[PDB]
Amino acid sequence: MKKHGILNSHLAKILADLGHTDKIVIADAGLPVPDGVLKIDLSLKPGLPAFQDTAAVLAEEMAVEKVIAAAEIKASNQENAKFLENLFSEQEIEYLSHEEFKLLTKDAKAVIRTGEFTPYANCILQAGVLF
Amino acid sequence: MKKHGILNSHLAKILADLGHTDKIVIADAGLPVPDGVLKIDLSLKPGLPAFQDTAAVLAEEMAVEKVIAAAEIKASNQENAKFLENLFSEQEIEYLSHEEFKLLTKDAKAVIRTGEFTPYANCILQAGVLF
Amino acid sequence: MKKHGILNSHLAKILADLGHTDKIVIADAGLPVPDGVLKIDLSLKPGLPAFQDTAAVLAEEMAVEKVIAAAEIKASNQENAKFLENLFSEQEIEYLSHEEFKLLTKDAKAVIRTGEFTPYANCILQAGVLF
Amino acid sequence: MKKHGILNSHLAKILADLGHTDKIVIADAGLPVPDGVLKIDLSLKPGLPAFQDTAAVLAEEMAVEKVIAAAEIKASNQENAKFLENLFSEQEIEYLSHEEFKLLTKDAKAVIRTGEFTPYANCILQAGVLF
Amino acid sequence: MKKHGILNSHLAKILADLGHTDKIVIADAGLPVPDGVLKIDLSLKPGLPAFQDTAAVLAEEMAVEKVIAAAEIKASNQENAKFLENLFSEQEIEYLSHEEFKLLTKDAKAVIRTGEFTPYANCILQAGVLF
Amino acid sequence: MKKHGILNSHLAKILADLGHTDKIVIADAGLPVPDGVLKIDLSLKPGLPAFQDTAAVLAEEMAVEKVIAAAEIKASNQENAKFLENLFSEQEIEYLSHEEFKLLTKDAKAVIRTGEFTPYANCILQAGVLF
Amino acid sequence: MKKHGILNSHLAKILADLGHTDKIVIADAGLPVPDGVLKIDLSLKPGLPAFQDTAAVLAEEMAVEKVIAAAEIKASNQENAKFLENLFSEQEIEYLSHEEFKLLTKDAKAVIRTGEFTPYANCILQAGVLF
Amino acid sequence: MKKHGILNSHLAKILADLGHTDKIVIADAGLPVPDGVLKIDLSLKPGLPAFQDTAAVLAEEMAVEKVIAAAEIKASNQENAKFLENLFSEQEIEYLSHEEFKLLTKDAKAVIRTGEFTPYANCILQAGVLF
Amino acid sequence: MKKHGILNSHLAKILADLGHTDKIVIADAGLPVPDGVLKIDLSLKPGLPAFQDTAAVLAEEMAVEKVIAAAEIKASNQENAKFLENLFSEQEIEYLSHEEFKLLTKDAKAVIRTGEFTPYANCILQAGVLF
Amino acid sequence: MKKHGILNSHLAKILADLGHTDKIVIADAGLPVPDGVLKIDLSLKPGLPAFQDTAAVLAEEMAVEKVIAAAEIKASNQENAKFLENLFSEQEIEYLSHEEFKLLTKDAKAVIRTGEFTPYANCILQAGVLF
Ligand SMILES: [Cl-]
Ligand SMILES: [Cl-]
Ligand SMILES: [Cl-]
Ligand SMILES: [Cl-]
């Protein structure tokens, strides 16, 4: 077995190929995945795994220089909106309209689907660099 | 979005094709997956999702007529061994040596990998029939 | 076997992947399917299965937030046109010219071909969200 | 559109390649499909389309020289057994144990899944010759 | 064997998927086939099978609502030009410059190559509807 | 255009790869094609093209050192049987039971389906060498 | 073995599909092959086989109506330039800048790499018709 | 970028999938790789990278429970043979004839080719388990 | 074994297809690889193999006519910038903004990932000609 | 361009993967190529390129530890049999019946087809080691 790094085989493969500025998506259960974009579905049942738990894990295993989210998350979902803000306190957090956000997901390397059943609980983690 | 059934897209696809007697595997994080057998990895981190939580979900979404496990689970892991026994109280529960168990996984339609970090926490759910 | 959800394996796989706003088509025996769009043909013989029957099943298995049809259905196929309005009484129903409808079918995740042998018996079901 | 022949596009393609002795299967909603065998699922909901209805269409579009079924069809399905005897009057009708039957489906060009929710409602059509 | 419809397996599969307005091409031994368009070559030797014979069989197995040919066919190959006009008496027969005709063949679902060795003996058959 | 050799593009590709002792099959409209063997269908309609005509073309474009056919042809299809003897009068002609013949078609590089509608009108051409 | 036509199997396949106006490329050991264009490398060692020898074979096995080359060849490779004029004395010979020539190779069905080691020893053969 | 784990993307993907008892190979510049076994070549030039260096990295990133090598390493490559015994002091080390070793490499998930230019510098690392 | 040329099997294959002007990339451990561009990752651990070492090998096995790098390499990597100037004395060395540079890598035949953990340590080698 | 090694791109890729004991074949225009074995056809026309010339280039670019040929080559083609013996003076030259030789070609990594038109001018070159 692999000694270090993220436990998920599909996810490790994705992180393995990450280059500076590449993007991945952590999505709630309703986010549509653009055609051509790999979908790694971790959902077990409504609410599991949670948007937060998943974001925490990716944050611990990926060097993130920027986080992007839909402004709508601030309106209907303040919980996750503040979680994301605190988790990535030092990174760059930008809000776009959900529409623009979805457009940007076309460039993602993969969309990680969680069981999160709350509005606009989605974000784009943009890869930083180790040197 | 799909109104009913299991929440996981990969899993729904697998269940969708299940015929009477087809088999699927729910595995701990260390079970080797035979070549050719689809691997759907739900692991988030050590212990998550748990062997039990996953088995409960599959039991609620799949008609199971038989469960197979490695006898070794009774020795080092009584917790999950009793969970499986209670969960599938009415189904047929057979124990094989872990070796024989792994041989049988060659015929599985897929191996669902969980984050379970406990010995021999693996089982084969054999599809029943609705009529 | 799969306990809940739509019975058709091909269809279940399609619903499994539906994200908010994704679209699928239910078509009559003569609708052309754009290149690259998955075609799942349910037809048994002329008239079977019927547009109506298929539309009913999909409505029970998918959360539809909007329905789209060719305006030519109202004039050339009153029976099926009113059926739609009735079945999707709560959903937003939009009519486009048949030509524009077909253009839109290029974005569909799949086209479900029925045995319907009546003019313009086609519709696009746009996925809603469970939360 | 295609003028003559079976209406289903997937089935049409299967019949097109049939040579003397090639076999197809018509199955109830629970028959397991062997790996590598194309599955054309016509099912719409439990019971539809029916084993009998589907079997009739295929008899009308395919030159059958022999029909094979599981003996268990007589004990667990007396009706469907008579139907076959009647439908394929001039054809040889062989019965095997369900197990032998399933082993035989491995050679089939495809398995047509019906919505039949009746025990052992399966059969193999063995193509004859037109000259 | 297949009881009804066109005898050629490759052609059968093509006709089977035809939706209203889809197009196929019947070509002479010299027509270039656009990249990506399935080529079904029926030629045996110079002149066989003939453009006319092939065109007759397709007329008998496919519902044609429109026929397209290059105007140059009226200049050098009046025989085949007259044949085509009489074969599709009721249908719409449109002539385009050979150059424009070739551009249109890019939308075709397939190009059937015959053994015809006479100038511009090519045509596009656009599919109609059975209802 | 290609100046020399067989006209059929599909057939030219098959001959081009022919090595000493590679086998090819010319079949009637009913011979089953073993799985994995390329099927090049030249059939236009019942009887066209004819086994004889197809055989003549191949004989003139392929160096044949041996021909194999089913014994059943001598009595059930005396015409095409005489033909074979005459056409390949200088080659070694071997007859096997139709069953053995079919098993032997497993090793064929391709099966060329003709429109021939007479029983046992099949044969195998075994490639020779030009030096 | 194949009795007639070009000896190279890879080349025979390319010619077999040639339609009126399809293009082919004979290149020296340095010409870049555009992505997506099939590369058939005949090179054995520097200078072998020669552009001239390769051109002669293709000219005798392919009906050519036009030849295109880079103007740079007339001055940087007078020998092979004269050759071309002589070999294709009856065909239309057009010269383009080497850059335009390369852009034009994007549409080629294949690039045949020779061992030629002299600058601008490349050309495009445009297929003609046998009728 | 990926924060933890092995730096090589190809290797990380391989470790990602390791299940208890799965095997991978570290090979010298001359070991033959069985068909079907993924080859990840790290070689830069003769000697680089070295067997030892690669073995060290893999040992730090993979949980090895057993190591396998050719007995010919002891006699023909003392330096690398003792290196192994030292690095994997706690693991079970088994030696087989080189021929038997190679046979075993057929079961490997991949062969990591190094630039090692010394005799029999090859080994199989069998994955252990983290629990 | 291969007698001459670069030792890496993956690189050898890339160099083999190089035509005049084709480009390859040598990248540090953080350069993102565009979709569709083959990635040959040689990295072993941070720093190994080095950008310079890798660049030297490629210069010894590939005829480079031009080298392209990001201007940012001079400010964030004064050493590696001199190395390139020295190594490719007779070659044109063009500098672009890192952004333009990345856009250029989209046309590369492949990206060779080194273990270089130094800012902007990337370059594009543009193949020259041997005649 | 590639600076060193064999000129042929297809051949380069093959040599690049050669591991000790791997085998490739150099064949005359008549040797059949076993199914699944990559065929690299270098033939231009009868006799070119010659078996000898091709064999010389491969001897110069590949480390051969053994040569295999059919004994029939000594009977009909002594010229090429002597050439082979002198070319590989030091190496082991084993003769097998042509039939056995052909069986061995199934293990080959590739078959290089030359234009040689003389009997049994084929051989297997088994790879050696550079250390
Ligand atoms: Cl479902
Ligand atoms: Cl049909
Ligand atoms: Cl990792
Ligand atoms: Cl090389």
> Which bin fits J83, alpha (ψ -120 to 50), beta or left (φ > 0)?
alpha
Confirm if D16 and D98 have CB atoms less than 8 A apart.
no
Dig out the tokens for I24 from the structure: 């390859």
Q: What are phi and psi of B111, to 5 degrees?
A: -120, 120
Adjacency order of strands within the sheet including H123-127: H38-41, H110-113, H23-27, H123-127, H64-70, H92-96
Three-class DSSP category at J8: coil
The Cα–Cα gap between C96 and D59 comes to 41
The Cα–Cα gap between I30 and A64 comes to 13
> Which bin fits E99, alpha (ψ -120 to 50), beta or left (φ > 0)?
alpha
The Cα–Cα gap between E124 and E24 comes to 6
Tokens 């006479």 -> residue: E118
Confirm if G87 and G3 have CB atoms less than 8 A apart.
no
DSSP code per residue over D14-50? HHHH--TT-EEEEE-TTPPPPTTS-EEE---BTTBS-
* H30-60 per-residue burial string, b: 16 or more CB within 10 A, e: under 16: bbbbbeeeebbbbbbbebbbbbbbbbebbbe
> Which residue among G1, G9, G62 sits closest to F3, beta carbon to beta carbon?
G62
Confirm if E120 and E68 have CB atoms less than 8 A apart.
no
Confirm if H118 and H51 have CB atoms less than 8 A apart.
yes
Three-class DSSP category at B44: coil
* Closest alpha carbon within chain E to G128: E30
Tokens 């000594």 -> residue: J74
Whole-number Å distance, alpha carbon I7 to ligand 4 midpoint, is: 8
**CB contact (8 A) between residue G20 and residue E32:** yes
The enclosing H or E element of F72 equals helix F72-76
CA-wise closest residue to E115 among E27, E12, E10, E7: E27
Question: Is some CB atom of chain F closer than 8 A to the CB atom of G60?
Answer: yes
Give the helix, strand, coil percentages of chain D, each rounded to 5.
35, 25, 40
The Cα–Cα gap between I4 and I115 comes to 25
> Which bin fits H128, alpha (ψ -120 to 50), beta or left (φ > 0)?
beta
Dig out the tokens for A28 from the structure: 């709630």
CB neighbours (10 Å) of residue G75? 10
First to last CA, chain D: 28
| Number of inter-chain CB pairs under 8 A, B vs D | 25
Q: List CB contacts of H53: < 8 A, sequence separation 6 or more.
A: H114, I44, I48
What ligand has the least distance to the C-alpha of C12?
1
**Beta-sheet pairing, J110-113 with J39-41:** parallel
What ligand has the least distance to the C-alpha of I7?
4
What ligand has the least distance to the C-alpha of J11?
4
> Which bin fits A33, alpha (ψ -120 to 50), beta or left (φ > 0)?
beta
Min Cα separation C2/chain B (Å): 5
> Which residue among D32, D117, D118 sits closest to B19, beta carbon to beta carbon?
D32
Question: Is some CB atom of chain J closer than 8 A to the CB atom of H74?
Answer: no
The alpha carbon torsion through E17, E20, E23, E24 (nearest 10 deg) reads 50
* A58-96 per-residue burial string, b: 16 or more CB within 10 A, e: under 16: bbebbbbbbbbbbebbeeebeebbebbeebbeebebebb
Dig out the tokens for H42 from the structure: 């790290």
Is A107 labelled as part of a ligand binding site? no
Tokens 């041997």 -> residue: I130
**Beta-sheet pairing, D64-70 with D92-96:** parallel
Min Cα separation I120/chain J (Å): 26
The Cα–Cα gap between F64 and F129 comes to 8
> Which residue among B1, B9, B18 sits closest to C2, beta carbon to beta carbon?
B18
Q: Which domains does chain I have, with CATH numbers?
A: 8-128 (3.40.1650.10)
Confirm if C123 and C25 have CB atoms less than 8 A apart.
yes
Question: Is some CB atom of chain F closer than 8 A to the CB atom of J30?
Answer: yes
Dig out the tokens for C62 from the structure: 């998918």
Show residues of chain F in contact with D130, CB under 8 Å: 29-30, 46, 117
Show residues of chain B in contact with H18, CB under 8 Å: 32
Dig out the tokens for A62 from the structure: 């990926």
Show residues of chain J in contact with F20, CB under 8 Å: 30-32
- Helix-then-strand count for chain J, H and E: 5, 6
First to last CA, chain E: 28
Resolution of the structure, angstroms:
2.3
CB neighbours (10 Å) of residue E72? 18
Confirm if F124 and F58 have CB atoms less than 8 A apart.
no
> Which bin fits A57, alpha (ψ -120 to 50), beta or left (φ > 0)?
alpha
Angle at CA G25, nearest 5°, toward E119 and G29?
A: 170
* D8-27 per-residue burial string, b: 16 or more CB within 10 A, e: under 16: bbbbbbbbbbbbbbbbbbbb
Question: Is some CB atom of chain E closer than 8 A to the CB atom of F39?
Answer: yes
Q: Is the dihedral of CA H43, H44, H50, H56 positive or negative?
A: negative
Three-class DSSP category at D79: helix
Question: Is some CB atom of chain A closer than 8 A to the CB atom of H65?
Answer: no
Question: Is some CB atom of chain G closer than 8 A to the CB atom of I20?
Answer: yes
The alpha carbon torsion through G54, G57, G58, G59 (nearest 10 deg) reads 120
> Which residue among E1, E16, E63 sits closest to D13, beta carbon to beta carbon?
E16
| Number of inter-chain CB pairs under 8 A, E vs G | 23
Show residues of chain D in contact with C39, CB under 8 Å: 9
Dig out the tokens for C14 from the structure: 């399609």
I touches D, CB cut-off 8 Å, minimum 3 pairs: no
Whole-number Å distance, alpha carbon G29 to ligand 4 midpoint, is: 15
**CB contact (8 A) between residue A20 and residue I39:** no
The Cα–Cα gap between G120 and C100 comes to 51
Is C28 labelled as part of a ligand binding site? yes
Three-class DSSP category at I116: coil
> Which bin fits C87, alpha (ψ -120 to 50), beta or left (φ > 0)?
alpha
Q: List CB contacts of C41: < 8 A, sequence separation 6 or more.
A: C112, C113, D8, D9, D10
Is E120 labelled as part of a ligand binding site? yes
> Which residue among E33, E39, E118 sits closest to G131, beta carbon to beta carbon?
E118
Touching subunits for chain I (3+ Cβ pairs under 8 A): A, G, H, J
Question: Is some CB atom of chain B closer than 8 A to the CB atom of A42?
Answer: yes
Active-site residue B10, yes or no?
Answer: no
The overall longest dimension of chain I from CA atoms, in Å, is: 43
Min Cα separation F67/chain D (Å): 22
**CB contact (8 A) between residue I10 and residue H53:** no
